[PDB]
Amino acid sequence: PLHSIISSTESVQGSTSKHEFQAETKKLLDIVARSLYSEKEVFIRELISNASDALEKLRHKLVSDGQALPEMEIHLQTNAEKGTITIQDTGIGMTQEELVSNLGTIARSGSKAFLDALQNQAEASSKIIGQFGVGFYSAFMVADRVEVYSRSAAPGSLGYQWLSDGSGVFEIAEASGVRTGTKIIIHLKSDCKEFSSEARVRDVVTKYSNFVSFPLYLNGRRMNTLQAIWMMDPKDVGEWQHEEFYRYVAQAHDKPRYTLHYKTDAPLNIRSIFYVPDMKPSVALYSRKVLIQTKATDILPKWLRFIRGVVDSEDIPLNLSRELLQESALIRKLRDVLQQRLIKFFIDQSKKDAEKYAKFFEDYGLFMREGIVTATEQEVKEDIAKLLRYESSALPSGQLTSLSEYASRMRAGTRNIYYLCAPNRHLAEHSPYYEAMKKKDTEVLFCFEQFDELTLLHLREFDKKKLISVETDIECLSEKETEELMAWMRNVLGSRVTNVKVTLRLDTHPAMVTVLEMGAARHFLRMQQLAKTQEERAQLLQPTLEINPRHALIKKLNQLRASEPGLAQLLVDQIYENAMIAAGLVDDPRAMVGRLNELLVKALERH
Amino acid sequence: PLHSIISSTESVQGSTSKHEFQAETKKLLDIVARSLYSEKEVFIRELISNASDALEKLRHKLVSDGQALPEMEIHLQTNAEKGTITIQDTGIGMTQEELVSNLGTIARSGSKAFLDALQNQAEASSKIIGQFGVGFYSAFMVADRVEVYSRSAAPGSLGYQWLSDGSGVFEIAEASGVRTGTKIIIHLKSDCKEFSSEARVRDVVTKYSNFVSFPLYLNGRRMNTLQAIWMMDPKDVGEWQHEEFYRYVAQAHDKPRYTLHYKTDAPLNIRSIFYVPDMKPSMFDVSRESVALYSRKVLIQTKATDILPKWLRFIRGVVDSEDIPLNLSRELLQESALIRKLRDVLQQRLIKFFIDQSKKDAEKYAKFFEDYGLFMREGIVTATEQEVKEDIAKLLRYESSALPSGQLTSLSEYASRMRAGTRNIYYLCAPNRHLAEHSPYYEAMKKKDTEVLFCFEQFDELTLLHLREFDKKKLISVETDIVVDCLSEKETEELMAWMRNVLGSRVTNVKVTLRLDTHPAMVTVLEMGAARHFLRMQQQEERAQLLQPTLEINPRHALIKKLNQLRASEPGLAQLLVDQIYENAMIAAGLVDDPRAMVGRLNELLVKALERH
Ligand SMILES: Nc1ncnc2c1ncn2[C@@H]1O[C@H](COP(=O)(O)OP(=O)(O)NP(=O)(O)O)[C@@H](O)[C@H]1O
Ligand SMILES: Nc1ncnc2c1ncn2[C@@H]1O[C@H](COP(=O)(O)OP(=O)(O)NP(=O)(O)O)[C@@H](O)[C@H]1O
Ligand SMILES: [K+]
Ligand SMILES: [K+]
Ligand SMILES: [Mg+2]
Ligand SMILES: [Mg+2]
């Protein structure tokens, strides 16, 4: 029964006091430097972001005041002997009260205040990175003492000094000889001395700060060399630049078969490039030219993970650890827009180049099939379904058709789409479920790839037309002499073959095999790898055999049945084997090799 | 062009100033309530954790003095019409001083102070959740008016008041009629009203706080129903209780075929339980892309970042660990040093567990291997350190020539019965033993006297190649060992050369092999395992230019002997038969991409091969 203690017999009989929220700083520093960032290496990323923000501030101030632009670069210095990493820029710089307000206060960012006083949102609002005010304190998880030397770019400002150890106290002083900008000296912790190595610093800078708007120098060498091609015009960027850019973001060496430069910003300011790898079997997320996460499996659907590239947006919501605010109230709109655009782009690619898209299909067909089954909204499934290509009975072999054009030639009277799932076209065209509708002039799609039977049930509908599985619907030998041959073949092949029938549509093949139970035909293929014992093969599927008397081999078996019964008994098994191979029910015909080899030696005994 | 601006020309001339770090409280509240927690529904998870911490504090206080323990419970009250959610517990409660110190201060946590005041670190140190002091302020993610009532459980405390809009200022007063324990009233935002429904609250509480240490009532519905069987001794929990918990974590209705209750404290404080489903793993589920962490009995939701090895994704369960470092948003510290050690420790235990399972019930493990063996094979190839490859290799089961059909052998015990000084493990790939016993490559090995393993399942050849050695013995395939190791001499030579004339575009070299007895021909490749890997998944004249199909013939075979007179008496038939002989070797090697092309030549061969009959 009901059991609750919630009640409203409670009132207020006190005096309304006025307390302002407090915040102890020791635990805040401990949280920032111990339990805020997943990886220890992001401190140089945050420092480079601060340097880039300072350089952007100086550039904006200079262009607003209308004078020359001096050298503005970020210099990373690493001294292995001293165990220190030094970052220095030529940004705006910071004064006494500026240092006290920005560096000495948690969550207080001067970048946000500068952005609020910009009132244009077009000059540098999309380039200022800092928004939280805790980025600098990420340097304390690697350093036992941080030395910051800054001097404002104002005409007359004096240099200052900033010492701290992360214990809630910082000793700011006065320094002379400070060059314009900010010079941050970091003395690494005993357990964090590995950041005093040039290799690690270069690796982290390439991982995070490879696309900084300003020159980045590590030990005196410029090492950015990547001008963020996702930010320029799609027509201005050449195709050759896309080749190495894909090799960088995807960490591959091949070429991209497709390249989509998406820049339309209806929901969010998106500057993204999407690549499709050539290697038949994961998009980098960026915010203001700073990497957020490499995998970024949240912005794109799981079935779209096969594409590579970059997605850059300056309006995405970021976590305090500068990572993606996954499953935010706003990110889901971006996922649908990206998903619809790629589907629209793929559809356009199919029309522009059918053969290229057809080749592209089997490389990543399992991804589209995965999308339909894992999709929740039915309308979403219809979008991916437009990307599917299938072979049709009314169209010759080797060419594929999509669902949309299949319904284009669909009869007006009928309302449902018929699809048949078979290992290959040859066996599909002979199944009795297929010619059941061949009496009428209907058209059926032939399904070949695996998991394709799985997705059609989940799709269950296309363009208001239901998908109906066909399975669930339900010169020549004399006639007299051919029949007596049929009875003999039903004795020697009694177990394997249910019945043998005459075929009038053969030119050079002595015999094929036909199945009644395509549901169990795939069972035969899956058991080829394991437990393909010949004796048990007959009971599993019970294959049916069809032959033509016009063939020479069939015409030869007439005399072989009596003159050489031993050779005939081995040849009829061999003819059955080739029928199995031609229809594709057997992947590797290793079993027939042993019997074929001994068949040939007595096939030439009189030569 | 190496230029740098870094120098040490700077010197200090002034006197250092004394300063302390500050903090913008309003901006801190904005950060916590807007850009701290990715998922907006974790606010009641944080508040339920706070209620559990308060209840644990009260229980510890009331057992320290050893008196009666009153009822302990957590109530989730939802009022859809008012658009409010109530979270009331019967914990210690808070006075005016505690309300101002804890609730009014960011990062100030009374649980951490209580933990440090324990002076024993043995009773409640492992079961207090709050450690940061910002968990409460997650309520401002959905609430524009947070209303908290609290009163300490001290003998003679009085109720109080707590109002805040998240604007950096909060109102505290005195309230009469307050019952013992903290009561929290949350007034939901206009855009966050979805938490004023029973279904959403039930879903999120099930998502995070099923295993709280106290009864949790959602509108009078006690919804724990699972007392965290991974806490008590492994022997205490029964088999039937394992199933009920397995249905929850795995979200499946089947039974677990294996159960590993792991509880260690030396490397890490781990209370983990692992289940292996008895159902056949879905071949679609394998293609698409495990365990759920618990820390102080709350779910962290870090299924990503493969905390468990990728090949171990087939097991379901929970890994409880009170020492893993959580970040502010209460998720994992991804790619940390400690979490990597957790993956290594868990991998060794799971590998050791399966080894013991194989030695316990070989028949049961044989069924287990044929179901989840693709994961072990996938793990070996994707492993980057050699040591773990042998650890997974002990889980592999193969059947060998020495043992009868249907009996599987491990790599370790196969290496136990080798010769005195043979540093070579021999394996052969074929769909079945019958097709492996009669394979020409195994026939050539009958000259030697060594035990050889048979590889039946798919991707098994690639697995041995990636392992490449086991127990300091190399893994040499049967095909590879051929290359590294009747008819008169005269007549064979022109037959030898003539085949090369007709198969110049297909075969590179053909040479005599006396090892073969009942096979007319055999084809050997240097990297046969790679060649089989090449042509199967990633995929005639163009194929031969890269594969180098070195064919071999057996002069003692009747068919090769028959090629003597057929090469001269019936020259037309000789070329066609050799093409069949050459193609037959490929099938024995499994290098045929599509045998549908060869049957047409095969069928028309039989027209003229026996046309005289
Ligand atoms: N090298 C620098 N040069 C000039 N100003 C700086 C520099 N580093 C930091 N600052 C200032 O000090 C503030 C505090 O640093 P920081 O913690 O990075 O805040 P933020 O970068 O603006 N926000 P966040 O995204 O967390 O980094 C910044 O907002 C800047 O105003
Ligand atoms: N329902 C409650 N009953 C009693 N004390 C409470 C309650 N909620 C919060 N507190 C106290 O207020 C403090 C601040 O809350 P909170 O932000 O959750 O800190 P925390 O839980 O200890 N650390 P965290 O993991 O971030 O939640 C807690 O540490 C408790 O001391
Ligand atoms: K700051
Ligand atoms: K607090
Ligand atoms: Mg910053
Ligand atoms: Mg808490």
Coordinates of N, CA and C in Angstrom, one line a residue, chain A residues 1 3-6 10-15 17 19-22 24-25 27-28 31 35 37-39 73 75 77 86 88 103-108 112 131-132 149 161 168-172 174-176 178-179 183 217 220 318-320 325-327 373 450-451 510 529-532 552-553 556 578 581-582 589-590 593 596-597 603-607, chain B residues 2-3 5-7 10-14 16-25 27-28 31 35-36 38 73 75 77 88 103-108 132 149 161-162 164 168-170 172-176 178-179 220-221 283-284 326-328 333-335 431-432 435 520 562 566 570 584 587-588 590 595-596 599 602-603 606-607 609-613:
Chain A
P1 N 0.8 -1.2 0.0 CA 0.0 0.0 0.0 C 0.8 1.3 0.0
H3 N 2.9 4.4 1.2 CA 3.7 4.7 2.4 C 4.6 5.9 2.0
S4 N 4.2 7.0 2.5 CA 5.0 8.3 2.3 C 4.9 9.1 3.5
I5 N 6.0 9.9 3.7 CA 6.1 10.8 4.9 C 6.1 12.2 4.5
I6 N 5.9 12.5 3.2 CA 5.8 13.9 2.7 C 4.5 14.6 3.2
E10 N 4.0 22.2 7.6 CA 5.2 22.9 7.9 C 5.2 24.4 7.4
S11 N 5.6 25.3 8.3 CA 5.5 26.7 8.0 C 6.8 27.4 8.3
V12 N 6.9 28.7 8.1 CA 8.1 29.5 8.3 C 7.8 30.5 9.4
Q13 N 8.6 30.5 10.5 CA 8.4 31.3 11.6 C 9.6 32.1 12.1
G14 N 10.6 32.2 11.2 CA 11.9 32.8 11.5 C 12.0 34.2 10.8
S15 N 13.2 34.7 10.8 CA 13.6 35.9 10.1 C 14.4 35.7 8.9
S17 N 17.0 35.9 6.6 CA 18.4 36.5 6.6 C 18.8 36.7 5.1
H19 N 22.3 36.0 3.1 CA 23.6 35.4 3.0 C 24.0 35.3 1.5
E20 N 25.2 35.8 1.2 CA 25.7 35.6 -0.2 C 26.5 34.3 -0.3
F21 N 26.4 33.7 -1.4 CA 27.1 32.4 -1.7 C 28.6 32.6 -1.5
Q22 N 29.2 31.7 -0.8 CA 30.7 31.7 -0.6 C 31.3 30.6 -1.5
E24 N 35.2 28.4 -1.0 CA 36.5 28.2 -0.5 C 37.5 27.9 -1.7
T25 N 38.6 28.5 -1.7 CA 39.5 28.5 -2.8 C 40.5 27.3 -2.8
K27 N 40.0 24.1 -1.9 CA 39.3 23.0 -2.5 C 39.0 23.2 -4.0
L28 N 38.8 24.5 -4.3 CA 38.5 24.7 -5.8 C 39.8 24.5 -6.6
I31 N 40.3 20.8 -6.8 CA 39.4 20.2 -7.8 C 39.9 20.4 -9.2
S35 N 40.8 16.8 -10.2 CA 39.6 16.0 -10.6 C 38.8 16.9 -11.5
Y37 N 40.2 17.7 -15.3 CA 40.6 17.3 -16.6 C 41.0 15.8 -16.6
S38 N 40.4 15.1 -17.6 CA 40.7 13.6 -17.7 C 42.1 13.3 -17.9
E39 N 42.8 14.1 -18.8 CA 44.2 13.8 -19.1 C 45.1 14.9 -18.6
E73 N 53.4 35.9 -32.0 CA 53.6 34.5 -32.1 C 53.6 33.9 -30.7
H75 N 55.4 31.1 -28.4 CA 56.7 30.4 -28.3 C 56.7 29.4 -27.2
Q77 N 58.8 26.8 -25.0 CA 60.2 26.5 -24.7 C 60.2 25.4 -23.7
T86 N 58.2 26.4 -20.9 CA 57.9 27.9 -21.0 C 57.1 28.2 -22.2
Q88 N 55.4 31.6 -24.1 CA 55.4 33.0 -24.1 C 54.8 33.5 -25.4
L103 N 44.1 36.3 -12.8 CA 44.8 35.1 -12.4 C 44.4 34.7 -10.9
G104 N 44.1 35.7 -10.1 CA 43.9 35.5 -8.7 C 42.4 35.1 -8.3
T105 N 41.5 35.0 -9.3 CA 40.1 34.7 -9.1 C 39.7 33.5 -9.9
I106 N 39.1 32.5 -9.2 CA 38.6 31.4 -9.9 C 37.4 31.7 -10.7
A107 N 37.3 31.2 -11.9 CA 36.1 31.4 -12.8 C 36.0 32.8 -13.4
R108 N 36.9 33.7 -13.0 CA 36.9 35.0 -13.5 C 37.8 35.1 -14.8
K112 N 35.9 36.7 -21.4 CA 34.4 36.8 -21.4 C 34.0 38.3 -21.3
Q131 N 36.2 30.9 -22.0 CA 34.9 31.3 -21.5 C 34.6 30.9 -20.1
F132 N 35.4 30.1 -19.4 CA 35.1 29.6 -18.1 C 35.9 30.3 -17.0
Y149 N 55.2 36.0 -16.1 CA 55.7 37.4 -16.3 C 54.9 38.0 -17.4
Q161 N 55.4 40.5 -12.1 CA 55.8 39.1 -11.8 C 54.7 38.4 -11.1
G168 N 46.5 28.1 -2.8 CA 45.6 29.2 -2.4 C 46.2 30.5 -2.2
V169 N 47.6 30.7 -2.4 CA 48.3 31.9 -2.2 C 49.2 32.1 -3.3
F170 N 49.2 33.4 -3.9 CA 50.1 33.7 -5.0 C 50.8 35.0 -4.6
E171 N 52.1 35.1 -4.9 CA 52.9 36.2 -4.6 C 53.3 37.0 -5.8
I172 N 52.4 38.0 -6.1 CA 52.6 38.9 -7.3 C 53.6 40.0 -6.9
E174 N 56.9 42.9 -8.7 CA 57.2 43.8 -9.7 C 58.5 43.3 -10.4
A175 N 58.5 43.3 -11.7 CA 59.7 42.8 -12.5 C 60.1 43.8 -13.5
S176 N 61.3 43.8 -13.9 CA 61.9 44.7 -14.9 C 62.5 43.9 -16.0
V178 N 60.8 42.8 -18.6 CA 59.7 41.9 -19.2 C 59.4 42.5 -20.5
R179 N 59.4 41.6 -21.5 CA 59.0 42.0 -22.9 C 57.5 42.0 -23.0
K183 N 54.8 35.8 -20.3 CA 55.8 34.8 -20.2 C 55.5 33.9 -19.0
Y217 N 55.6 28.3 -32.0 CA 57.0 27.9 -32.1 C 57.3 27.1 -30.8
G220 N 61.9 27.2 -30.9 CA 62.4 28.0 -32.0 C 62.0 27.6 -33.4
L318 N 30.2 23.6 -24.2 CA 31.4 22.9 -23.8 C 31.3 22.6 -22.3
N319 N 31.8 21.4 -21.9 CA 31.9 21.0 -20.5 C 33.0 21.8 -19.9
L320 N 33.0 21.9 -18.5 CA 34.1 22.6 -17.8 C 35.4 22.0 -18.1
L325 N 29.6 18.8 -24.3 CA 28.5 18.7 -23.4 C 27.5 17.6 -24.0
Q326 N 27.8 16.4 -23.8 CA 27.1 15.3 -24.5 C 25.7 15.2 -24.0
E327 N 24.8 14.9 -25.0 CA 23.3 14.9 -24.7 C 22.8 16.2 -24.0
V373 N 18.2 -0.5 -38.5 CA 17.7 -1.3 -37.4 C 17.9 -0.5 -36.1
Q450 N 24.6 -9.9 -46.7 CA 24.2 -10.4 -45.4 C 23.7 -9.3 -44.5
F451 N 22.8 -9.6 -43.6 CA 22.2 -8.7 -42.6 C 21.1 -7.8 -43.3
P510 N 25.4 -28.3 -67.7 CA 24.6 -29.6 -67.6 C 23.5 -29.6 -66.5
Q529 N 31.7 -23.3 -43.1 CA 32.9 -23.1 -42.3 C 33.1 -24.3 -41.3
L530 N 32.0 -24.7 -40.6 CA 32.1 -25.7 -39.5 C 31.1 -26.8 -39.8
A531 N 31.6 -28.1 -39.7 CA 30.8 -29.3 -39.8 C 30.1 -29.3 -41.1
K532 N 30.8 -29.4 -42.2 CA 30.3 -29.6 -43.5 C 30.3 -31.1 -44.0
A552 N 26.0 -32.3 -73.5 CA 26.8 -33.5 -73.9 C 27.1 -34.4 -72.7
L553 N 27.4 -33.9 -71.5 CA 27.7 -34.7 -70.3 C 26.4 -35.5 -69.9
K556 N 26.0 -38.1 -72.4 CA 27.1 -39.1 -72.3 C 26.7 -40.1 -71.3
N578 N 29.3 -29.7 -59.4 CA 29.5 -28.5 -60.2 C 28.2 -27.6 -60.1
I581 N 28.4 -25.8 -57.0 CA 29.3 -24.7 -57.1 C 28.8 -23.5 -57.9
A582 N 28.2 -23.8 -59.1 CA 27.7 -22.8 -60.0 C 26.6 -22.0 -59.3
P589 N 35.0 -25.3 -52.5 CA 34.8 -26.7 -52.9 C 36.0 -27.6 -52.7
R590 N 36.5 -27.6 -51.4 CA 37.6 -28.4 -51.1 C 37.2 -29.9 -51.1
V593 N 37.5 -31.9 -54.5 CA 38.8 -32.0 -55.1 C 39.3 -33.4 -55.0
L596 N 37.3 -35.5 -57.4 CA 37.5 -35.1 -58.8 C 38.8 -35.6 -59.3
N597 N 39.9 -35.6 -58.5 CA 41.2 -36.1 -58.9 C 41.2 -37.6 -59.2
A603 N 39.0 -41.3 -66.0 CA 38.4 -40.7 -67.2 C 39.3 -40.7 -68.4
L604 N 40.5 -41.1 -68.3 CA 41.5 -41.1 -69.3 C 42.2 -42.5 -69.5
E605 N 41.6 -43.5 -69.0 CA 42.2 -44.8 -68.9 C 42.5 -45.4 -70.3
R606 N 41.7 -45.0 -71.3 CA 41.9 -45.5 -72.7 C 42.7 -44.6 -73.5
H607 N 43.2 -43.5 -73.0 CA 44.0 -42.6 -73.8 C 45.5 -43.0 -73.8
Chain B
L2 N 65.6 28.9 -37.5 CA 65.2 28.7 -36.1 C 65.4 30.0 -35.3
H3 N 64.3 30.6 -35.0 CA 64.4 31.9 -34.2 C 63.5 31.7 -33.0
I5 N 62.3 33.8 -29.1 CA 62.2 35.0 -28.3 C 62.3 34.7 -26.8
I6 N 62.6 33.5 -26.5 CA 62.7 33.1 -25.1 C 64.1 33.5 -24.5
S7 N 64.1 34.2 -23.4 CA 65.3 34.6 -22.8 C 65.2 34.8 -21.3
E10 N 65.2 39.1 -17.8 CA 64.4 39.7 -16.8 C 65.0 39.6 -15.4
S11 N 64.8 40.6 -14.6 CA 65.2 40.6 -13.2 C 64.1 41.2 -12.3
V12 N 64.1 40.9 -11.0 CA 63.1 41.4 -10.1 C 63.7 42.5 -9.3
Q13 N 63.0 43.6 -9.2 CA 63.5 44.8 -8.4 C 62.6 45.2 -7.3
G14 N 61.3 44.9 -7.3 CA 60.4 45.3 -6.3 C 60.3 44.3 -5.2
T16 N 57.8 41.6 -3.1 CA 56.7 40.7 -3.4 C 55.5 41.2 -2.5
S17 N 54.3 41.0 -3.1 CA 53.0 41.4 -2.4 C 52.3 40.1 -2.0
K18 N 51.5 40.3 -0.9 CA 50.8 39.2 -0.3 C 49.4 39.2 -0.9
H19 N 48.9 38.0 -1.5 CA 47.6 37.9 -2.1 C 47.1 36.5 -1.9
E20 N 45.8 36.4 -1.9 CA 45.2 35.1 -1.9 C 44.2 34.9 -3.0
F21 N 44.0 33.6 -3.4 CA 43.1 33.4 -4.5 C 41.6 33.7 -4.2
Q22 N 40.9 34.3 -5.1 CA 39.5 34.6 -5.0 C 38.7 33.7 -5.9
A23 N 37.4 33.9 -5.9 CA 36.5 33.1 -6.7 C 35.2 33.8 -6.9
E24 N 34.8 34.0 -8.2 CA 33.5 34.6 -8.5 C 32.4 33.5 -8.2
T25 N 31.6 33.8 -7.2 CA 30.6 32.8 -6.8 C 29.5 32.7 -7.8
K27 N 29.6 33.3 -11.1 CA 30.1 32.6 -12.2 C 30.4 31.1 -11.9
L28 N 30.8 30.8 -10.7 CA 30.9 29.4 -10.3 C 29.5 28.7 -10.3
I31 N 28.7 28.1 -13.9 CA 29.5 27.0 -14.5 C 28.9 25.6 -14.0
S35 N 27.4 24.3 -17.3 CA 28.5 23.7 -18.1 C 29.3 22.8 -17.3
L36 N 28.7 22.0 -16.4 CA 29.4 21.0 -15.6 C 29.0 19.6 -15.8
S38 N 27.0 17.0 -18.1 CA 26.5 16.8 -19.5 C 25.0 16.4 -19.5
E73 N 15.3 6.2 5.5 CA 14.6 6.1 4.2 C 14.8 7.4 3.4
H75 N 12.8 9.6 0.3 CA 11.5 9.8 -0.3 C 11.7 10.7 -1.5
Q77 N 9.3 12.6 -3.9 CA 7.9 13.0 -4.1 C 7.8 13.9 -5.3
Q88 N 13.2 14.1 0.3 CA 13.3 14.2 1.7 C 13.9 12.9 2.3
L103 N 25.9 24.5 2.4 CA 25.1 24.8 1.3 C 25.5 26.2 0.7
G104 N 26.0 27.1 1.5 CA 26.3 28.4 1.0 C 27.7 28.6 0.5
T105 N 28.5 27.5 0.6 CA 29.9 27.6 0.1 C 30.2 26.6 -1.0
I106 N 30.7 27.0 -2.1 CA 31.1 26.1 -3.2 C 32.3 25.3 -2.8
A107 N 32.3 24.0 -3.1 CA 33.4 23.1 -2.9 C 33.6 22.8 -1.4
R108 N 32.8 23.3 -0.5 CA 32.9 23.0 0.9 C 31.9 21.8 1.1
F132 N 33.4 16.3 -3.5 CA 33.7 17.6 -4.1 C 33.1 18.8 -3.5
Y149 N 14.6 22.4 3.5 CA 14.3 22.4 5.0 C 15.2 21.4 5.6
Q161 N 15.4 27.1 7.3 CA 14.9 27.4 5.9 C 16.1 27.7 5.0
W162 N 15.8 27.5 3.7 CA 16.9 27.7 2.7 C 16.3 27.9 1.4
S164 N 17.0 29.7 -2.6 CA 18.0 30.3 -3.5 C 17.5 30.2 -4.9
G168 N 23.6 33.7 -6.8 CA 24.7 34.0 -6.0 C 24.3 34.5 -4.6
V169 N 23.0 34.6 -4.3 CA 22.5 35.0 -3.0 C 21.4 34.0 -2.6
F170 N 21.5 33.6 -1.3 CA 20.5 32.6 -0.8 C 19.9 33.1 0.5
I172 N 18.2 32.3 4.1 CA 18.1 31.3 5.2 C 17.3 31.9 6.3
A173 N 16.4 31.1 6.9 CA 15.5 31.5 7.9 C 15.3 30.3 8.9
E174 N 14.3 30.5 9.8 CA 13.9 29.5 10.7 C 12.5 29.0 10.4
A175 N 12.3 27.7 10.3 CA 11.0 27.1 10.0 C 10.6 26.2 11.2
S176 N 9.3 26.3 11.5 CA 8.7 25.4 12.6 C 7.9 24.3 11.9
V178 N 9.4 21.4 11.2 CA 10.3 20.6 10.4 C 10.5 19.3 11.1
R179 N 10.5 18.2 10.4 CA 10.8 16.9 10.9 C 12.3 16.6 10.8
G220 N 5.9 6.8 -2.7 CA 5.5 5.6 -2.0 C 5.9 4.3 -2.6
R221 N 6.6 4.3 -3.7 CA 7.0 3.0 -4.5 C 8.4 2.8 -4.2
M283 N 25.7 -12.1 -34.2 CA 26.7 -11.8 -35.2 C 26.5 -10.3 -35.7
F284 N 25.3 -9.8 -35.6 CA 25.1 -8.3 -35.9 C 25.7 -7.5 -34.7
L326 N 37.3 10.1 -9.8 CA 36.2 10.7 -10.6 C 36.4 12.2 -10.7
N327 N 36.0 12.7 -11.9 CA 36.2 14.1 -12.2 C 35.0 14.9 -11.6
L328 N 34.9 16.2 -11.8 CA 33.9 17.0 -11.2 C 32.5 16.5 -11.6
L333 N 38.0 9.7 -15.0 CA 39.1 10.4 -15.5 C 39.7 9.6 -16.6
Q334 N 39.2 9.9 -17.8 CA 39.5 9.1 -19.0 C 41.0 9.1 -19.3
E335 N 41.5 7.9 -19.7 CA 43.0 7.7 -20.0 C 43.9 8.1 -18.8
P431 N 38.3 -26.6 -43.1 CA 37.0 -26.5 -42.5 C 36.7 -27.6 -41.5
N432 N 37.2 -28.8 -41.8 CA 37.0 -30.0 -40.9 C 38.3 -30.8 -40.9
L435 N 38.6 -32.9 -44.1 CA 39.3 -32.1 -45.1 C 40.7 -31.7 -44.7
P520 N 47.7 -35.2 -57.1 CA 48.4 -35.0 -58.3 C 49.3 -33.7 -58.2
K562 N 49.7 -39.9 -66.3 CA 48.8 -39.8 -67.5 C 49.1 -38.6 -68.4
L566 N 49.1 -38.0 -72.9 CA 48.1 -37.0 -73.3 C 48.8 -35.7 -73.7
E570 N 47.2 -36.3 -77.4 CA 46.0 -35.4 -77.4 C 46.5 -34.0 -76.9
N584 N 42.8 -27.1 -59.3 CA 42.5 -28.0 -58.2 C 43.5 -27.7 -57.0
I587 N 42.2 -24.8 -55.0 CA 41.0 -25.1 -54.1 C 41.6 -25.8 -52.9
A588 N 42.5 -26.7 -53.0 CA 43.2 -27.3 -51.9 C 43.9 -26.2 -51.0
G590 N 42.7 -23.2 -51.0 CA 41.7 -22.2 -50.6 C 41.9 -20.8 -51.1
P595 N 34.9 -19.9 -57.5 CA 34.9 -21.2 -58.3 C 33.9 -21.3 -59.4
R596 N 33.0 -20.3 -59.5 CA 32.0 -20.3 -60.5 C 32.5 -20.2 -61.9
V599 N 34.1 -24.0 -63.2 CA 33.2 -25.1 -63.5 C 32.9 -25.2 -64.9
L602 N 35.6 -26.8 -66.3 CA 35.6 -28.2 -65.8 C 34.6 -29.0 -66.5
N603 N 33.4 -28.5 -66.7 CA 32.3 -29.3 -67.4 C 32.7 -29.6 -68.8
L606 N 35.2 -32.4 -69.2 CA 34.7 -33.8 -69.1 C 34.0 -34.2 -70.4
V607 N 33.6 -33.3 -71.3 CA 33.1 -33.7 -72.6 C 34.1 -34.4 -73.4
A609 N 37.3 -35.3 -72.2 CA 38.2 -36.2 -71.5 C 37.7 -37.6 -71.6
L610 N 36.4 -37.9 -71.6 CA 35.9 -39.2 -71.7 C 35.0 -39.4 -72.9
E611 N 35.1 -38.6 -74.0 CA 34.3 -38.7 -75.2 C 34.4 -40.0 -75.9
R612 N 35.6 -40.7 -75.7 CA 35.7 -42.0 -76.4 C 34.9 -43.1 -75.7
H613 N 34.5 -42.9 -74.5 CA 33.7 -43.9 -73.8 C 32.3 -44.1 -74.4

